Amino acid sequence: LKCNKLIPIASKTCPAGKNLCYKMFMMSDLTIPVKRGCIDVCPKNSLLVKYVCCNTDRCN
């Protein structure tokens, strides 16, 4: 599972059973994300992130 980055037309498949197409939003300004990629569960969000996510190839 890889999915799309900030742009609508992006990538296809990255490692393991990480189903969620992440939407890595900035903790300080959410709306337009930092990155858009691949993950199992929306991760442990640090001072610079608040991750959004959806279960299949290119769903973000």
Curated annotation (Swiss-Prot):
Keywords per UniProt = Cardiotoxin, Cytolysis, Disulfide bond, Hemolysis, Membrane, Myotoxin, Secreted, Signal, Target cell membrane, Target membrane, Toxin
> Where in or outside the cell is it found?
Secreted; Target cell membrane
**GO CC terms of this entry:** extracellular region; membrane; other organism cell membrane
Q: List the disulfide bonds.
A: C3-C21, C14-C38, C42-C53, C54-C59
Q: An example of a Gene Ontology BP annotation on this entry? A: killing of cells of another organism
Task: Please explain the role this protein plays, according to its UniProt record.
Answer: Basic protein that binds to cell membrane and depolarizes cardiomyocytes. It also shows lytic activities on many other cells, including red blood cells. Interaction with sulfatides in the cell membrane induces pore formation and cell internalization and is responsible for cytotoxicity in cardiomyocytes. It targets the mitochondrial membrane and induces mitochondrial swelling and fragmentation. It binds to the integrin alpha-V/beta-3 (ITGAV/ITGB3) with a moderate affinity and inhibits protein kinases C. It also binds with high affinity to heparin.
Protein's recorded name: Cytotoxin 1
